[PDB]
Amino acid sequence: RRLGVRAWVKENRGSFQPPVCNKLMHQEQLKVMFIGGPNTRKDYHIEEGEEVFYQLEGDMVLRVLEQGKHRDVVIRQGEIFLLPARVPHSPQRFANTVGLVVERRRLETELDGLRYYVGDTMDVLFEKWFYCKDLGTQLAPIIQEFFSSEQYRTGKPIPDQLLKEPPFPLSTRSIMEPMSLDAWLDSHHRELQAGTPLSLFGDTYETQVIAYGQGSSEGLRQNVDVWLWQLEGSSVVTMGGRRLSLAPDDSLLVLAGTSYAWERTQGSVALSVTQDPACKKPL
Ligand SMILES: [Fe+3]
């Protein structure tokens, strides 16, 4: 059950290049995925959940549509970034890179969308909305449909093929700056080692990426998965009758419906990632 994050990436190295570029480490309530490149594209993904990006190896560029403007969010190696819900985004990946993306299982009410725009404008050229179960697998025919369309050929939209409006309001939020994960952890060392766990992004988002220093935690049975990643030093997770020693870079998925006890050593640093849909921000 313990997975050394870079050890898992090395074992699955061949996944992080075309044609598929990705491999899901975890794929139940919490989608923990690792993505490579090269992969340059003009399609913009839109969803009701949030997406956490972290660059393990090399840099990536997340193109976003923010408050009526095109913006390129450069995510450098070691940088973490949280995308709020319903922001159109188009990830650009390069050869020999590895990025972590965390997202969640959709609620049965939730729609995902894929859009192509007319050149450098906000006018929609082609769009498809769907109920997401396996994102990569569902996007492939949509993209193939686009590349075989009159819209791609002419660069002109077919009005009858566009929705009158999106199924939900698109985000009105300002996008944060990506930040160095190690720099933020080091700058907050006194609070972390004083037994106070800290939210990296705060209460204005659904997702909770929490940093933990020394101390003891107890996780109650939840209908959401929790992913733990020991960054520095070690800790012990007691779960399902077993004591699991997390060494530097070890990660552990706590499946929905499982309780656990967590004992973190002095000087140790770990993260937990939760994307609970009950915490979705009102529209
Ligand atoms: Fe996305």
165 a known binding residue? no
Sequence-separated contacts (24+) of 232-239 with Cβ below 8 Å? 232/267, 232/268, 232/269, 233/264, 233/265, 233/266, 233/267, 233/268, 233/269, 234/265, 234/268, 235/262, 235/263, 235/264, 235/265, 235/268, 235/270, 236/262, 236/263, 237/261, 237/262, 238/262, 238/263
Structural resolution in Å: 1.9
Query: Cα(128) to centroid of ligand 1, in Å?
Result: 14
In the DSSP assignment, the letter for residue 278 is G
> In angstroms, what is the span from residue 61 Cα to ligand 1's centroid?
13
Query: 45 CA to middle of ligand 1, Å?
Result: 5
The verdict on whether residue 89 carries a ligand-binding annotation is: yes
Q: Is 45 annotated as a binding residue?
A: yes
How many residues would you count in the chain? 283
Distance 207 CA to ligand 1 centre (A): 14
If you write DSSP's letter for every residue of 142-175 in order, what string do you get?
HHHHHHTSHHHHHS---GGGS-SS-SSPPP-PPP
Q: How far is the CA of 183 from the centre of ligand 1 (A)?
A: 26
For the chain, give every domain's residue range. 1-283
Which CATH code, of 3.65.10.10, 2.30.30.110, 2.30.30.60, 2.60.120.10, is assigned to 1-283? 2.60.120.10
Distance of CA 220 to the CA centre of its chain: 24
What angle (nearest 5°) sits at the alpha carbon of residue 256, between those of residues 252 and 257? 115
Q: Contact 122/65 with Cβ under 8 angstroms?
A: yes
Tell how far the Cα of 104 is from the centroid of ligand 1, in angstroms.
11
How far apart, in whole angstroms, are the C-alpha atoms of residue 223 and residue 244? Answer: 22
